[model samples]
Every structure is written in C-alpha cells, then in structure tokens.
Target: ASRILLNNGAKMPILGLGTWKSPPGQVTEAVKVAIDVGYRHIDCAHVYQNENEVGVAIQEKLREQVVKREELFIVSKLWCTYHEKGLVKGACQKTLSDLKLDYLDLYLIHWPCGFKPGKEFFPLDESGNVVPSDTNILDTWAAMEELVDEGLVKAIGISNFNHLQVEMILNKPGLKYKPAVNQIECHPYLTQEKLIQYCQSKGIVVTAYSPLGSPDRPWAKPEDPSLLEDPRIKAIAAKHNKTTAQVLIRFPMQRNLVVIPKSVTPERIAENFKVFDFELSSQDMTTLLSYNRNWRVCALLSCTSHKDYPFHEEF
Candidate 1:
C-alpha cells in the first residue's frame, strides 16, 4: 500500500478503517479481521464512544505480532464539545488511555465548530437561546499544539473543516503546529474540489469520508438514494470488473486524498481494504467528478437550535 508522509515526517497509510457507527460488540473482531486482511491504520474518535473495544483489538494484534505499534498508523479525533483551553490534550489522553496505545500517529480536531462543554448537538439550548461558548477557536488550537509538545500525539490535523478554518490555523501568530490534514465528506456526489485543493496547496493532506455514499448508514432515511447503485459509478465498476464501492474508494486515491470506508461485516471489511490493486483512467475520473450533486451525507447545520452548528447552508 502507498503511504503519505506528514509534514512532521510520519507516514500514514492511504486507506484506513473508519469506526463510525461501528457497533460496540462487533468492531473488535472487525479490527482484527481488517489487520488480517492488510489494513494498517484505524481512524478512531472519542465522539464515536468505542475506543475501549478498539484498544482491545489493537492489544490482541500486538500480542500475536500481527502488527507492531510502529507498523500501524492510528488516527483519532477530538470532539467539538471539548474545545476548551485545557481540555483538548485531556481528551486526546483519555482516548490513548482507553486505546492502550503509547501515542497517536495522527490526531484531528473532529469539527471546526466549537461549543460549550456539553451543549446540545445542534444550534440551540433547551431554553431557545443561542448559547455560544466564550472559548475561541484559537484558544482551542493552542491547547491542540500542546498535545504535540507533550508527546501524546505525533501529528495533529483538523476534520470537517473548510478553507476559512484552515486559514485561521495558518495565520495564528507563532502557531507551533500547523494542521497537517483536514478530513471531510468527499465522494462522487460531493466532490469538494476547491476545499481539497486549498488544503493541498498549504501542504495539508485531505482525508475523505462517506466514500461509496454511506449506503447503509444508520441515520439514512428510507427514501434516501445509494451511491453503490448509481449508474455512472456502476459503469466505472464494470470497466474494471470491481465493486462500485471499490471504484468510489479508488477514485479518491486517484485524486490524491486518503479515503476511509467503514464496514463491520467480515467479508465487507476485507473487501473495503482491498483498494490498492487497480487504477482508474483519466476519462473515468473526469466522469466521476462531473457527477457532483452537492450531496452531503451528514450536516448538523440545518436545525436552528444547536450551538455548534457550523454552517447555515441547505443540504
């Protein structure tokens, strides 16, 4: 598998397992199976609330010598609720303690939005007032820098952020650690071309989530469409004799972004990790990029009541 080296010189596998919505009881076995199938990176988050099980799987792999800590590139996220000055590193530490790992290869601020420590997930408080936290993003970033200085994390980045957020981090005076990457929703439906370009221009890598259009995502409505079945995507799959899921993941890599596609089923977990064997043509890449519907898989900004809602745009 190809690897992208971070600005700090840490190498990250181009494809990884995403633990989002991975059931607590099933993920440990999934992680083990993923390693057996050749996955070396596991993207985790405290907000996912499942690090204890992820830790167990990692330790098991270590005991058997399936993969050593240095051979693996474990990525984790810091939740928006903990965007306070002194709490950022604490959040990273708790995940480390839970995962039973020495330190993280990549740590990301999960969202650009900030909130009061425990505010509602959307735009408002229970009393119908806009509850903004006094803690500015720069303060949170300063705390994030401390994570690197303290040796708890090797490289740090941001997720679900836009150009403005990246600029904010870049422009901060004496910023000790410039963000090394930004993870965001990217697929044929939501290409996010300019955003990806902006990060790359600044020497920051881009990590894409919701690949394959998140077909079985838990929150998906019954009427919601699936990307795996899209005719355009299927045509590309047919050209290569590959699964449409494989085509989607491969598309992102051809565009030079790291892609994380999640699955808990043993067969599917193995299937998702088998992405490095094929190549897509330039014409197909153009076709896939042409299909952007501006569709986004997850956006909490529409509801008017949550304090940390990042944007007011329609989905």
Candidate 2:
C-alpha cells in the first residue's frame, strides 16, 4: 500500500476501506477481511451506526496478532449533532469506547454544518427539514484540537468542506492546528480539481471518498448516471485488463490523492485492494479528468439551508 505524509507528520495509507454503507451485519467481517488483505487505514463515522461492529473485528484481529494497533490507522468522524464544544468529547469518547481503541489515527468533522445536538441524529423541523445548531465550525475545530492535546486523536481533519470553508479555518485567529485533510466526494464524474489543488497548495491532504460513484447510496435516483457502467470507463478498464471499479479506484491515486473505496463482500474487498499492481497512463488520467461534470452522489441537500452549507461555493 502507498502512503502520504499528513500535515501533522503522521503517515497515512493512501487507500483504505470506507464503512459508509457497510452495515452492522456485514462491517465486522468486511473490516477483518480488509485487515487480512493488507489494508492499514479504515475510514469510519459515527453516523454509519456500525462502529461497534467494526471495533469488534479490529479487536479480534489485534488479539489474533494479525495486525498490531500501532500498525493500523483508524479514522472516525464527529457527527454533525456533536459539533458543539461541550459535546465533542462525548462523541469522541463514544467512538473510542465503541471502536475499542484508546486513540484514533485521524478524526474528522463529518460535515461543515452543525445539527441540533440531541438524541435525534437528524432532528427535523416541523416542515421536515434538518434542524441547524448555533455552534460555529471553528468551535468544532477547537474542540478537535483539544482531542489532540489529550491524545484522543493523533490528527484531525474536515470532510465535505468547500475551498472557502477551509480557508476560513486556515485563517482563523489563534488556530492551534491546521487541518490535516479534506475528505470529499471524488470520482471521474465529479472531479474537484480546483478544490483538490487549492487544498494541496495549502499542504492539506485531499482524500477522495466515494471513488466508485457510491452506487449504494440510498438517496440515489433511478435515472442517475453510473460510473461503473459508463462505456468510456469500461473501455479504459478493458485496456488495462482491470475491472471498472479498479479503474475508478485508481483514478484519484494517479492524481496524487488518497482514496477510500468501501466493500463488504470478501471477494470485492480483496479486489479493491489490487490497485497497487497497475498504473493508469497519462492519457488514461486525462480521459478520466475530461469526464468531470461536477456531479455529487452524496449531496446532503436536506440541510442546504444551514449557514455553513458548503456546496454553494463554485469550487
């Protein structure tokens, strides 16, 4: 597996297994299989509702000596509801307890906006829109810095953040720590070159999430385009004698960005890890880059009204 140097001087694996849709019934074995197949980084989130199961698999692997805790890089997110300063530690504590680890390699703010901090994960208003909290994003960053101070996390980052939003954090006065990464939706159809370059210029690592177009996202419309079935991508895959998913996973890698592709099936889990053997040519990369349409499969429109909504920016 390839690796990248994070801003905080921590080495992170360039590829990892994402746990967005790997539910409780499947995530345990999925994580175990990933660990067995040379995956060192595991991308997770509190909203996935499967951290406990993933933790069980991780602990089992550690106890069996398949991989030491120090050899693995584990990541989790602070859900929008826990963006409040006082509630941030509670969420990290739950993730630490649930994941059966004393510390995480990286922790992220799941989204730019804050949700109502309460038992309801998606607290909705009477009109059925998401309820927004008054807590600012900088406050959440400050709280995450506290985690680093106490050794709950080695590094912290932001996800689903636009370029301008990231600038706000970078320019915040008395900033304790610079964000180590900006995880966002990236694939052939939604190549965010500008944002990626912007982050890279700032020395913030850009992690490509949903590298295969996120086919399993529940809110996907029936008529939505599929990168896996695109003839252009299929042609490229045939040229490389690779599966379309493999080509998709390799797209961000050739651009020098980190990627996390999710899978629960043992075969697919192993297949996704086969990206290291092949390289996409320069023309192949240019062809993939030309297909960008600014599309987003994980567009969280339910809370578009929030002040910190990130997609409103052009970048």
Candidate 3:
C-alpha cells in the first residue's frame, strides 16, 4: 500500500495490476477480484483492446460500493499509431471513452516509435516491415501537455524510452511540464539500474512493467530463461518462504520502482497483491541484482529500424 509521489505532486500506488495480454473474458472478473483484495491501482492501455470490459468491471465495483471512483488510480497508454500532432487528443479521448472515465490518473506514450497513422496496429508494409511515421515525439509530447491543461489527464509520461529520449524531453526549450513517469520493462534480468537512477534524479518516477519476466508474451520462445524458473530466484524465494513470482514482484519495490504484474486468474490476481506484507533484505537485493542479463522479454523487433526505435541506446 506504499505510494510514490510524482513530480506533479500526485500519489501513485507502488504496485498495480497490469492488463496487457490479459484476455477479455477473464480480465473483468480479475479486476473485480483485485479491487476486492485491496488493489487500488490498475494498469491499462488502449492497445489491449479490452478497456470496455475493464470499464464494466470498474462500474460494477462502483455500483456495489466496493470502491469509489476517486479511490482507484487508473492508468492507460497512447498507442504508437496516434503519435501525430493532431491525433493525440482524439486518441486520449477514445481511451477515456472506452475506459468510461472522465479523467485518467496517468496516461503514457505506449512506445517511442511512431507507426503510420492508420487502423492497423502494426501498420506493416507489403515487405512485412513496420512503417515509420514522420511525427516528431516533441510534438506528440506537446499535445499530451494539452491533455493536462484541458483536464482530461492528471499526469503524462513516456514508455519504452531510453535515457537520451528522456533527456530530449527534459531539454526541450520552454517545456510546459516535465514527464511524471517513465514506464518500461524492468525485472531482475533487465534491472535498468542506470535509467532508473537517472529518472529518479530528475524527479520522474519509474513504473516497471513485465516484473515477472513476461513469460506469457507472444514472442517468447521455448529456450528463453524464465525468471520464475531460475534457480537463484527460486532459492531466494525459498529463503523468504514466498513463491518465486512473489519474489520477482517484491524485487522492484526494494529498488524503489512501481511494478505492475499482470494475471487473469482470480487466485493469482489476489496472490500478487500480497506483496506488501514483506520486504526484501539488502543481501537479497544484491543477489537479485547479480542476475541482470540485460534481457528484455517485450522487445519489439519489427520496429528496430524505425528512426525513433528506443532500445538501441545503452540505458
């Protein structure tokens, strides 16, 4: 139940439930269970294609008086296809409508790479390459600032951006508002220590996605190393008398980062919320840090060639 204060003075829960890859059929019940089990923050995105269901779940919870609207911190993202100058507001509006909320506590740019403005999520060409757009990230950010000004969003941030990209935002002349957060892939295998430190130094909070190594990600191969299956992590979990999944979820909080672990199962959703009962020791953190392999489970390989591809830098 700990909270991190953003630069804009908004308080965000230290742990949240992630909705990526969560199936529509099960996510609604999962959200209801999560809130019933004391979860106040839920991570969502327009690209997830299940915001309407999430909205229904929230509405049900409100109708039942399980939680108040202002008591929940709902987060969503702007897809890459809407990075164009004039497209940002419409995209945010669509997300708001789908989520059935008047305002979002946090809205993030889903990715640094901009896709061609169209209906296709990937916007691929005949050659199967991702089509890049000429929309500048600065312009997209400018429009995001307008959301805050117009009262549609409480705070705005970036996702999948490296240190240089963050610096670009920081250095923009007359930047109206600094980003309140930088959501990215983070876990023991890909700690991203430097990037986390830099963002914290600049007063921007870091929200970690894929905290359990994203084993269910679509692109994961059989040979990939699973964080939950790693012996070192398992041993640590055994020492703490907790499940490996819990250990992975607790690791990021020990490092002062907000972590969102996604699951559709009702029992597992409630289990992930039990992390606040314990704390990881310094020695345990050291052991976890040694496992960093700079691995990323959500690498978008199709957009590697894009001019705004963010993973090329050494964050």
Candidate 4:
C-alpha cells in the first residue's frame, strides 16, 4: 500500500478501513478479516462503542501473527466528555483498556465541541435538546496537547472540525505538538478545498471520512441523494473501469488525502481496499474537484436549528 508521510515522519496508509458502521457485535470478525487481507490501518473511535469487540479482533490477530502491533496503523479517538485537562488522561487510558492495546498511532479529539465533564454523550440536558451549548473546542484541544506530553497518545488531532476550530488550535500558546491531522466529511458533495489547503500549509494531514458519501447510513433520507448513483461520479467510474463507490474512494486519494470507507461485508471490505493499484487523471481529478457542492451528510440539525446549539457548525 502507498503511504502519506506525516509531519512527524510516520507513514500513514493512503487508505484506511472506517469502522463507523462495522456493526457492534461483528466488528471483531470484520477487523480481523480486513487485517488478514492486507488492511494495515483501521480507523476507530470511543463513541462508536465497538472498541471492545474491535479490540478482541486486534488482540487475536496479533496473537495469531497476522500482524504485529507495530505493523498496523491503529487509530482511535477521545469522546466529547473527556475534554477537560484533568479528565483527558483517564479518557485515554480507558480507550487503551478497551482496545487492549498499548498506544495508538493516532488519537483524535472526536469533535470540536465539549460536553459537560461528567456527561456521557452530547445533548447534556433538556435545553441541549432544545439548544445545545456553545462549548469552546480550544479548551479540549489544550487537554489533547497534554495527552501527547503524558504519552497517552503518540499523535493528536481533531475530527469534524471546521477551519476556525483548526486555526484556534494551531494559534494557541505553549503548543508542543501541532495537530497532525483533521478527519472530516470529504466526498463528491462536501469536498472542503480551502480547509484541506489550510491544514496542509500548517503540516497537518487531512483524512477523508465518508468517502462514498455514506449511502448506507440509516439516518440518511430517501431524498438525500447518493454519490454512488450520482451521474458525475458514475461517469467517472465508467471511464475508469471502476464502480462509483471505488471512484468516490479514489477521488480523495488522488488529491493526496486518506479515504476511509466502511463496510462489514467481506467482498465490499476487500473491494474498498483495492484503491491503491490505480490512478486518476489530472483532468478527471479536476472534474471531481469541480463537482464539490459543499454537501455535508452529517448535520447537527438535530441540534443545530435549535435555539442553543452547542456547535456553530452542524455536529
């Protein structure tokens, strides 16, 4: 597999397996199966709530010699509740315990916003249901920097963060390690060009999530549109002798960003892993870039349109 060199000189695989929809109970099997088939990098998170099962598979693979812990690029995230400096260490340790792993190659602050310290998940109270709190992401980022110092994480980053959030962290004082990456929605619809360029300028890598526009997402509406069937994407897929989904995954990679498309089905899983062998043309890459509509699949509209929404951008 081809790799992107991190600012710290770590080589991250161009493609990673997103574990968002890998099913709670089936993640272990899916993880192990992907590993056995040459998937060296796996993207995970605490909020996904499948870490325990995923950990079992990782442990089994290492025990069976499928891959050493060092051979695979294992990534995980700290949830919103662990945003405080005092709580960050415990939060990192909890994830370590759940994954049954020593250290993460990458650990991200799951979102730019923070929940009240003791809250398990977001939408802290009745008002949050009506109006989410406008929590500051920088406070959480400060804590994340401390995690690197304490050896809880090898590298630190943020996900679903807008450009403002990224800048806030980058401009903070006494910063030890800059955010090495920003994982966010990057598909034909929501391709964030300026943000990508901004992060790159500061030596931060961008990891493209929802590469295929996340069609199987249960919350997506019937009228919500599908990148898999989009005429532009289909045309590109046909031209490239690839499926639309593969084309979608390939789109982000050609632009020098890592793409993570998730699946539990074996054939689909293996297919998503086959993106490194081919290349898209400069013209086709321009076409893909031009198709960007600022279309975002994940919305904080559940809380966004509300009176007191916590995050300025959709969560």
Output the lDDT of residue 281, model 1. Answer: 93
lDDT of each: 0.84, 0.93, 0.91, 0.80
TM-score of 4: 0.92
Best-first order by TM-score: 2, 3, 1, 4
Best by lDDT: 2
Q: What digit string (tens of lDDT, one per residue) describes model 4 on residues 152-203?
A: 6778888877777788788887766788889988887777888888888888
Minimum summed lDDT over a 10-residue window in model 2 is located at: 297-306
Model 4, residue pairs in steric clash: 131-308, 132-308, 132-309, 132-310, 133-310, 300-315
Model 1 C-alpha lDDT per residue in residues 1-315, reported as the tens digit of each score: 489877888888999999988888999998999998999989999888789998899999999999888999899998877888877878888999999998999899887766667634434567755455567667878888898998899999988766776787899988988898889999988999888888998999999998877876767897776788888789889989989989998999998899999989999888877778889999999999999888877875333344434444322
Candidate 3 structure quality by residue, lDDT tens digits, 1-315: 489888888899998999988889989998989999988899999999999999888889988999998888999999999999889999999989988899999999999888999898899988878999898778889989999999999999999989999999999887999999999999999989999999999999999999999889998899998998999899998988888999999999888899999999988988887888888899999989998999998877778889889888899
- For candidate 4, the per-residue lDDT at 309 reads 32
Name the regions of candidate 4 deviating beyond 4 angstroms: 127-135, 305-315
Where is the poorest 10-residue window by lDDT in model 4?
A: 306-315
Per-prediction TM-score to the true structure, in the order listed? 0.94, 0.98, 0.98, 0.92
Q: Scored by Cα lDDT, where does model 1 land?
A: 0.84
Q: After superposition, how far is residue 85 of candidate 3 from its true place, in Å?
A: 1.9
| Runs of candidate 1 exceeding 4 Å displacement | 119-124, 127-130, 302-309, 312-315
Q: For model 3, what is the error of residue 72's alpha carbon versus the real structure, in angstroms, after optimal superposition? A: 0.7
